[PDB]
Design a protein around this ligand. Sequence first.
Ligand SMILES: [Ca+2]
Ligand SMILES: [Ca+2]
Ligand SMILES: [Ca+2]
Ligand SMILES: [Ca+2]
Lengths: 159, 372, 56, 56, 71, 90
Amino acid sequence: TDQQAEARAFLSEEMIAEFKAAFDMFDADGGGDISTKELGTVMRMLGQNPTKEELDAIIEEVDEDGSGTIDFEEFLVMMVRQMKEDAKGKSEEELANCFRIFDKNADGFIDIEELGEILRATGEHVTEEDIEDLMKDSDKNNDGRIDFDEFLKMMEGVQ
Amino acid sequence: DEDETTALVCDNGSGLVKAGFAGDDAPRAVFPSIVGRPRHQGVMVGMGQKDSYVGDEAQSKRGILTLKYPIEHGIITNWDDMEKIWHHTFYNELRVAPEEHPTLLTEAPLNPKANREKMTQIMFETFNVPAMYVAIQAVLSLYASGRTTGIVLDSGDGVTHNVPIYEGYALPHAIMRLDLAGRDLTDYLMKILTERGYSFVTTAEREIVRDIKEKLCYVALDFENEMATAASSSSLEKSYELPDGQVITIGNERFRCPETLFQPSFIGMESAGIHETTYNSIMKCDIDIRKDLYANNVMSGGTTMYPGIADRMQKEITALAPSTMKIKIIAPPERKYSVWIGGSILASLSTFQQMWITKQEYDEAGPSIVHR
Amino acid sequence: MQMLKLDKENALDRAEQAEADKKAAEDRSKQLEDELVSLQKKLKGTEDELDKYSEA
Amino acid sequence: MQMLKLDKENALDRAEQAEADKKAAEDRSKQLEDELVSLQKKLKGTEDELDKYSEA
Amino acid sequence: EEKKRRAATARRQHLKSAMLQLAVTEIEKEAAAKEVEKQNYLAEHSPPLSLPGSMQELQELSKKLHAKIDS
Amino acid sequence: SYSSYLAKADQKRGKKQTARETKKKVLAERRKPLNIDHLNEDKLRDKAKELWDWLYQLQTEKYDFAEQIKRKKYEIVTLRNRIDQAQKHS
Ligand SMILES: [Ca+2]
Ligand SMILES: [Ca+2]
Ligand SMILES: [Ca+2]
Ligand SMILES: [Ca+2]
């Protein structure tokens, strides 16, 4: 129930509103929870073809009451974890891409040169000091370059 | 990565636990398989009252606790005390939370069906691991030496075994167990060394006889004319310096200790010895598979580390085997962790994912599921 | 038959000699490798007795 | 003839294998023996730096 | 006691965001351009087919293609 | 180390020969003879293009599988730098 807490804390009425409408369609009989079968039907409508094992695992992932079914609460939890994972994937993908664009020389790094270029390539006004400064702040392993790890870190937050 | 990083490998022994992450080359954690229970009420400075102690804190503080060994001869004998060693392994030694890590465990050669079901019951129901798997120890040792058919002589702290394996299936009716191992071997050295005119009187004298056994002991080939050599008194002798100055000398007994593994008669054992037992396992197997087993005697275990063990075994079974046969005694250097390394390989493997027993399998099939 | 017999005996004698000095190369190897784990061990000991007496 | 030919081929293959891992035992022999004159050398040095710091 | 230092950091951010912002807009450029290369490559390796006459040609061509397919 | 030479032969030859037939088995399936020869005249027309599309079909995929490896090859380069950077035997 503690999870169902922050979970509902996370979402908005809007969210809940829709996640409910969605939950209702999952739930055939309209009883109050998705069964190992009610789920199977929706999955296929969603274009999958899970197996008994697969289904349960997907069920008991948010079944805190060992019911073997999912209620609109356990469900919101599930939606949340997903919402999370989705946003994380999209982020790292974008950054990953940005790194390849900034790299271009494909050495797997971003040297003060490229950093300058890309920076100077922005509209913004910048002098070398700015560039070397950003390098010094980003390059934690003090090797001159900026590795993907560091790039993830440095861009951590920025939009 | 989800579980590529995440698979744990725990090898439960009679003397030591070996533990770590599938992927690593060697165990992240190695420690005694004890659970100490304090004989008196009181505390260490700055700590609270402790009900129990495990591993090295139980060994170090042994004078105020009653020490207990959960695994007698490779089989788990006390399940209250084993769940204690597992708890310690996950939470303190590897410092992981178990409920998000798949766990590969090991069991012994003819481990009772009911035990494999019980440790599954405890893994899934009290530790809540995502998935687990129990491999047989000789089988992981073999596999870690690349192959799939061979016979493993496995020897650790409380048991010795011979497990003939054919295309991965350990052969139940040909497996032999000899209850004399490194533990028995340290206590015999003890006596032949007090018998050399010495005294291992305080507990700091007791413990180090075991470090003498590990560092200075040998398995001589032609143990016959090695005693004879001892007598002419060559520069065969070897003095070890104790916790203090007290330089103790060990010339001869140095090899009289591993000659116990070929002659159990040195210790009032009437059982046959390691080499004969390798052989008997082999003339208990199918006929067509006996050339395979003979060219693939894989050794694993702490007690098979005595230098020249392989040469003695080489010649021990050549001279019992039909001359038309090829003998081959593989003894790798990392052998004190073969078992573990075989598990690390297997569990980090690309194809193993489909044999993991998941909580889905369990909550649906009962402990029977993993039991096979 | 005769030719195959004679070059066979000469194959076997060269095999027997090659096994014999192999045994000898391996025994000398094993002896030196053992003398070593002993010298290298003695040394971690003299170098550790050392950082100790130099610090003291 | 046939028997003498077949146990001849098996005499030659065992000879060839026995020569091959002999070469290998001798190369490892040489390597370990050389690592040693080096470790034993390093030692007279750490033990002599020692009687010196111990006396001082 | 480095009271102003706060503005320095904000800059890196302002810049970092000027960078990402730059990235994204460049990202789709390379993307589409990339595709362009794809349709040109295909442009010549398999140009808008033009069915020949009737007799030997259609058969021939057909045999031509079919072999290339295995290729 | 020359006793391992026989391992090279056995191993390489083995795997390589395994790979071959597989490729043959696989590729063979995806192949339906040009059976249709002299059964109609306008047939060739509705036929020829179908082959044409199948070709274009394959061609386009080959191009994608290609660009893919390149992208992956770059994932590697980076994934290798992260491996070294994450060495620090300290
Ligand atoms: Ca329902
Ligand atoms: Ca429920
Ligand atoms: Ca670069
Ligand atoms: Ca860097």
